Amino acid sequence: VNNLYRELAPIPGPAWAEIEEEARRTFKRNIAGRRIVDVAGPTGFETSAVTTGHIRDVQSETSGLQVKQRIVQEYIELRTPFTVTRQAIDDVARGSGDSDWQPVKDAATTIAMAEDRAILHGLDAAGIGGIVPGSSNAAVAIPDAVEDFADAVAQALSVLRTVGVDGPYSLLLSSAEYTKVSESTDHGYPIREHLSRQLGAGEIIWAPALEGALLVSTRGGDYELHLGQDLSIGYYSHDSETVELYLQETFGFLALTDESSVPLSL
Amino acid sequence: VNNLYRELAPIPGPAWAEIEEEARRTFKRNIAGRRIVDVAGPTGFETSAVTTGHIRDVQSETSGLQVKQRIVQEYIELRTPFTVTRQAIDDVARGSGDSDWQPVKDAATTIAMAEDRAILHGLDAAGIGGIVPGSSNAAVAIPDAVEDFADAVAQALSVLRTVGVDGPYSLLLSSAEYTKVSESTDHGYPIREHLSRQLGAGEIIWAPALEGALLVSTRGGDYELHLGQDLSIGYYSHDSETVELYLQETFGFLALTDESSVPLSL
Amino acid sequence: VNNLYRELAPIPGPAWAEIEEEARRTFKRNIAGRRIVDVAGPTGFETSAVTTGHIRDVQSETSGLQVKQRIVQEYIELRTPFTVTRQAIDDVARGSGDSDWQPVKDAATTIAMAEDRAILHGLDAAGIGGIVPGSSNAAVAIPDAVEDFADAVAQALSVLRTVGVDGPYSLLLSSAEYTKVSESTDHGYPIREHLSRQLGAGEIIWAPALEGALLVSTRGGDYELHLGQDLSIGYYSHDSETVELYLQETFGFLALTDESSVPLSL
């Protein structure tokens, strides 16, 4: 057994497969930061830090002795617990195809939104710097009319061309802004296709953890997600009616390049 | 070239070998912590932290989300710069065997004493916990008479037997206490041989960075020195008369077991 | 060692690779003349001239003796010096991925803009004739409305068809004009795509060293860039805090055909 105590859960193999499939499917559709960030692959639960390669002066009074200390970013562990009824678990073996996995879907939505909220807006209680507050480019204001949003995106593209950052540009929209863009037309054809012709092999991302919008280069050396443990399901507890489980991820995140993104502020 | 800019120093190969030999020889005789601590070998300049395997609660307000952060110890870099005259360097090629390497000897003494001072007494400006302030055993008082020091060492051995720690025991003495023990007899034979019969395949260490004395088990799982870069000579600067160099080490240190050492207080 | 004194710079290999990558990446995105001009490849630092194949009468008073002198264009050397802090250089070996290379980016922008300014507008202090002042076609005036710029480009295309120059036509825009064209629509679709349908396998170039715009044939025998030394990084000087470096290029440039370009004047 490992720290996920999976062999102690009263859950047969095919019920495990269904819980896993709902977790993976819901998590993947709600993660947006992984599509724009270099993802150093999962290196295990035991890894704890990624260095920034910077040092810091340490106070010393010994004559002729200089002390530095390295600076790292310690990995955060995210955990979302969820409770599953044992009747759905047991009904999998009777041939049910409609067992209630809505708690695992809610947990996968919560952990995906927490991961994108750490990557995009930072987590200051742990010293994670997000892409949006670390951007050195000023925020281009989102207009209240959706017919001017393509002009705001072209202004952000001219900002990124002006500061010397060229690559494929992805545009991450918040759920409200993605909704406004998906439910609007300008000359008979939708505003999402007004946006997708400006990008040119960059994509338009629904980012439900974002607030406004974010234009970002997928140049490929600017943001680093250091995944320790990828999305894993663990066991916590059970009684006669329910099994208590959790989802878990460990990672560090480093936003190296400040200039390669333009926030679109609400 | 690497971060030690050795190929830019105006120092021929055989002068480099003499500086290296004086540095290694002086450093090894003055290090005492490496003889009692498990030394995980040099893993390079790039390593920056060793995990403690402990986590810490991070403040979060998202419903159903728990955030932890790993806890590591960031490596410290020690640097001792020293200046060598170019006349000694150049005289090596004329066949001199008495070139002045006293600055490198002073630098090696300083960096060895800084390393043992970090291991034994801690470095609180960097969060290194030393063996002596981390000891859970109370301090056995060193008597002012050197004829009672063997009784203090036997009392410390009974402390270590009482708390259930048995292995070969090493006894690290400060330079003043090592001097008092080496310059004293009790029944015609020296007090260092009164001490060495109590230890029984443990050794008596001269530890010039210590203040009083320290009895410690070499059981072999209690203290971990995580060497990043071992003792290296780097180049800094030169003028027509002198070359400015430095010695460098990077390491983390973890004192796992609090109970396996008894301080002997002055 | 060669005239770039690279082996004397206190810069390790991987820091050199990062400086090189930033220099190449910034230089390539800011050069526009190399995309329209035949580039005779780099022949080395030692080459000094390219002939124009024309001669000139020399004054002689000897009876029955005619003296001519060949006419060449001497290569120019461009040098942009930049200073890099040694802390960024040294942090590369500690695993930093955010070392400050903004000085090399500013230097690469400056040397790319100087090269395009020599190719496009000439360098009269060295006798380089640019494409724009050497054009025998009159300037088609850029309208102040961006909705008429496609009509100005069609007028310039009819000029080039009228003087008998047909090939793929590229359109080089200044940064202001490229910005106005990228941030504008005419019937729901951008003005850059109004321009790109007139060209027909010719491209639309952002040329930040240009003033107005320039339509030009890539017929393929009209303009010759004779590269002596391609973009190279050299070492100049260093102190304890910074290394002084430079970027360098050597080239001659010949604009053979006057008729194959139409300037679009501001």
PDB file of all heavy atoms in Angstrom, chain C residues 154-169:
ATOM      1  N   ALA C 154      -3.096  48.533 -54.059  1.00  0.00           N
ATOM      2  CA  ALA C 154      -3.473  48.155 -55.420  1.00  0.00           C
ATOM      3  C   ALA C 154      -2.927  49.141 -56.452  1.00  0.00           C
ATOM      4  O   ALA C 154      -2.559  48.741 -57.561  1.00  0.00           O
ATOM      5  CB  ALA C 154      -4.993  48.045 -55.537  1.00  0.00           C
ATOM      6  N   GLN C 155      -2.838  50.426 -56.093  1.00  0.00           N
ATOM      7  CA  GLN C 155      -2.216  51.407 -56.980  1.00  0.00           C
ATOM      8  C   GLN C 155      -0.723  51.142 -57.145  1.00  0.00           C
ATOM      9  O   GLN C 155      -0.179  51.273 -58.249  1.00  0.00           O
ATOM     10  CB  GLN C 155      -2.428  52.815 -56.443  1.00  0.00           C
ATOM     11  CG  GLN C 155      -3.794  53.391 -56.676  1.00  0.00           C
ATOM     12  CD  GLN C 155      -4.034  54.609 -55.824  1.00  0.00           C
ATOM     13  OE1 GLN C 155      -5.148  54.856 -55.374  1.00  0.00           O
ATOM     14  NE2 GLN C 155      -2.982  55.379 -55.591  1.00  0.00           N
ATOM     15  N   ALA C 156      -0.054  50.755 -56.058  1.00  0.00           N
ATOM     16  CA  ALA C 156       1.366  50.423 -56.133  1.00  0.00           C
ATOM     17  C   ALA C 156       1.597  49.145 -56.936  1.00  0.00           C
ATOM     18  O   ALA C 156       2.583  49.038 -57.679  1.00  0.00           O
ATOM     19  CB  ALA C 156       1.935  50.308 -54.721  1.00  0.00           C
ATOM     20  N   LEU C 157       0.672  48.186 -56.831  1.00  0.00           N
ATOM     21  CA  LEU C 157       0.747  46.974 -57.641  1.00  0.00           C
ATOM     22  C   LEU C 157       0.543  47.273 -59.120  1.00  0.00           C
ATOM     23  O   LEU C 157       1.190  46.656 -59.973  1.00  0.00           O
ATOM     24  CB  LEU C 157      -0.283  45.952 -57.165  1.00  0.00           C
ATOM     25  CG  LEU C 157      -0.040  45.274 -55.819  1.00  0.00           C
ATOM     26  CD1 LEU C 157      -1.339  44.731 -55.285  1.00  0.00           C
ATOM     27  CD2 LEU C 157       0.979  44.190 -55.946  1.00  0.00           C
ATOM     28  N   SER C 158      -0.336  48.231 -59.444  1.00  0.00           N
ATOM     29  CA  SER C 158      -0.505  48.615 -60.841  1.00  0.00           C
ATOM     30  C   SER C 158       0.710  49.370 -61.367  1.00  0.00           C
ATOM     31  O   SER C 158       1.044  49.226 -62.544  1.00  0.00           O
ATOM     32  CB  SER C 158      -1.781  49.439 -61.040  1.00  0.00           C
ATOM     33  OG  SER C 158      -1.697  50.718 -60.449  1.00  0.00           O
ATOM     34  N   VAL C 159       1.389  50.147 -60.511  1.00  0.00           N
ATOM     35  CA  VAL C 159       2.676  50.753 -60.878  1.00  0.00           C
ATOM     36  C   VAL C 159       3.699  49.676 -61.238  1.00  0.00           C
ATOM     37  O   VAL C 159       4.357  49.742 -62.286  1.00  0.00           O
ATOM     38  CB  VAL C 159       3.202  51.651 -59.742  1.00  0.00           C
ATOM     39  CG1 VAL C 159       4.657  52.030 -59.985  1.00  0.00           C
ATOM     40  CG2 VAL C 159       2.356  52.889 -59.591  1.00  0.00           C
ATOM     41  N   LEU C 160       3.831  48.658 -60.380  1.00  0.00           N
ATOM     42  CA  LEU C 160       4.823  47.612 -60.621  1.00  0.00           C
ATOM     43  C   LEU C 160       4.483  46.757 -61.835  1.00  0.00           C
ATOM     44  O   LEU C 160       5.388  46.292 -62.531  1.00  0.00           O
ATOM     45  CB  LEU C 160       4.986  46.729 -59.383  1.00  0.00           C
ATOM     46  CG  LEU C 160       5.990  47.227 -58.338  1.00  0.00           C
ATOM     47  CD1 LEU C 160       6.271  46.179 -57.287  1.00  0.00           C
ATOM     48  CD2 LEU C 160       7.296  47.708 -58.971  1.00  0.00           C
ATOM     49  N   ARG C 161       3.197  46.554 -62.116  1.00  0.00           N
ATOM     50  CA  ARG C 161       2.798  45.879 -63.343  1.00  0.00           C
ATOM     51  C   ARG C 161       3.036  46.754 -64.569  1.00  0.00           C
ATOM     52  O   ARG C 161       3.365  46.239 -65.641  1.00  0.00           O
ATOM     53  CB  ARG C 161       1.328  45.467 -63.241  1.00  0.00           C
ATOM     54  CG  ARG C 161       0.806  44.637 -64.403  1.00  0.00           C
ATOM     55  CD  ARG C 161      -0.597  44.105 -64.143  1.00  0.00           C
ATOM     56  NE  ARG C 161      -1.366  44.967 -63.251  1.00  0.00           N
ATOM     57  CZ  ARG C 161      -2.094  45.999 -63.652  1.00  0.00           C
ATOM     58  NH1 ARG C 161      -2.156  46.304 -64.938  1.00  0.00           N
ATOM     59  NH2 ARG C 161      -2.751  46.725 -62.766  1.00  0.00           N
ATOM     60  N   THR C 162       2.905  48.071 -64.412  1.00  0.00           N
ATOM     61  CA  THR C 162       3.081  48.998 -65.520  1.00  0.00           C
ATOM     62  C   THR C 162       4.545  49.093 -65.939  1.00  0.00           C
ATOM     63  O   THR C 162       4.850  49.158 -67.133  1.00  0.00           O
ATOM     64  CB  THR C 162       2.534  50.369 -65.115  1.00  0.00           C
ATOM     65  OG1 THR C 162       1.139  50.251 -64.829  1.00  0.00           O
ATOM     66  CG2 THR C 162       2.706  51.400 -66.219  1.00  0.00           C
ATOM     67  N   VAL C 163       5.472  49.074 -64.974  1.00  0.00           N
ATOM     68  CA  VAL C 163       6.890  49.131 -65.332  1.00  0.00           C
ATOM     69  C   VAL C 163       7.478  47.772 -65.665  1.00  0.00           C
ATOM     70  O   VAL C 163       8.693  47.670 -65.858  1.00  0.00           O
ATOM     71  CB  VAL C 163       7.766  49.763 -64.230  1.00  0.00           C
ATOM     72  CG1 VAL C 163       7.436  51.228 -64.078  1.00  0.00           C
ATOM     73  CG2 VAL C 163       7.602  49.028 -62.905  1.00  0.00           C
ATOM     74  N   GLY C 164       6.676  46.722 -65.702  1.00  0.00           N
ATOM     75  CA  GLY C 164       7.152  45.448 -66.186  1.00  0.00           C
ATOM     76  C   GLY C 164       7.876  44.590 -65.185  1.00  0.00           C
ATOM     77  O   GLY C 164       8.752  43.818 -65.579  1.00  0.00           O
ATOM     78  N   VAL C 165       7.554  44.702 -63.906  1.00  0.00           N
ATOM     79  CA  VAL C 165       8.191  43.909 -62.865  1.00  0.00           C
ATOM     80  C   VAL C 165       7.122  42.998 -62.292  1.00  0.00           C
ATOM     81  O   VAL C 165       6.207  43.465 -61.608  1.00  0.00           O
ATOM     82  CB  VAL C 165       8.806  44.791 -61.769  1.00  0.00           C
ATOM     83  CG1 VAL C 165       9.615  43.948 -60.806  1.00  0.00           C
ATOM     84  CG2 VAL C 165       9.662  45.901 -62.368  1.00  0.00           C
ATOM     85  N   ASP C 166       7.203  41.702 -62.560  1.00  0.00           N
ATOM     86  CA  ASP C 166       6.266  40.782 -61.942  1.00  0.00           C
ATOM     87  C   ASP C 166       6.996  39.657 -61.232  1.00  0.00           C
ATOM     88  O   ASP C 166       7.932  39.057 -61.770  1.00  0.00           O
ATOM     89  CB  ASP C 166       5.210  40.243 -62.941  1.00  0.00           C
ATOM     90  CG  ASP C 166       5.797  39.539 -64.159  1.00  0.00           C
ATOM     91  OD1 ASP C 166       7.022  39.510 -64.367  1.00  0.00           O
ATOM     92  OD2 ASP C 166       4.984  39.001 -64.936  1.00  0.00           O
ATOM     93  N   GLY C 167       6.569  39.410 -60.003  1.00  0.00           N
ATOM     94  CA  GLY C 167       7.008  38.302 -59.195  1.00  0.00           C
ATOM     95  C   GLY C 167       6.071  38.304 -58.023  1.00  0.00           C
ATOM     96  O   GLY C 167       5.076  39.035 -58.029  1.00  0.00           O
ATOM     97  N   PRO C 168       6.340  37.494 -57.002  1.00  0.00           N
ATOM     98  CA  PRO C 168       5.600  37.651 -55.747  1.00  0.00           C
ATOM     99  C   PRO C 168       5.975  38.979 -55.113  1.00  0.00           C
ATOM    100  O   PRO C 168       7.145  39.361 -55.091  1.00  0.00           O
ATOM    101  CB  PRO C 168       6.063  36.461 -54.901  1.00  0.00           C
ATOM    102  CG  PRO C 168       6.799  35.568 -55.834  1.00  0.00           C
ATOM    103  CD  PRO C 168       7.341  36.424 -56.914  1.00  0.00           C
ATOM    104  N   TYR C 169       4.976  39.699 -54.638  1.00  0.00           N
ATOM    105  CA  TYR C 169       5.180  41.017 -54.071  1.00  0.00           C
ATOM    106  C   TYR C 169       5.042  40.939 -52.561  1.00  0.00           C
ATOM    107  O   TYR C 169       4.016  40.485 -52.053  1.00  0.00           O
ATOM    108  CB  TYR C 169       4.179  42.020 -54.633  1.00  0.00           C
ATOM    109  CG  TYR C 169       4.130  42.104 -56.131  1.00  0.00           C
ATOM    110  CD1 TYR C 169       3.113  41.483 -56.843  1.00  0.00           C
ATOM    111  CD2 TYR C 169       5.089  42.809 -56.838  1.00  0.00           C
ATOM    112  CE1 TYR C 169       3.049  41.572 -58.210  1.00  0.00           C
ATOM    113  CE2 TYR C 169       5.035  42.898 -58.203  1.00  0.00           C
ATOM    114  CZ  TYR C 169       4.016  42.281 -58.882  1.00  0.00           C
ATOM    115  OH  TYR C 169       3.963  42.372 -60.244  1.00  0.00           O
TER     116      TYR C 169
END
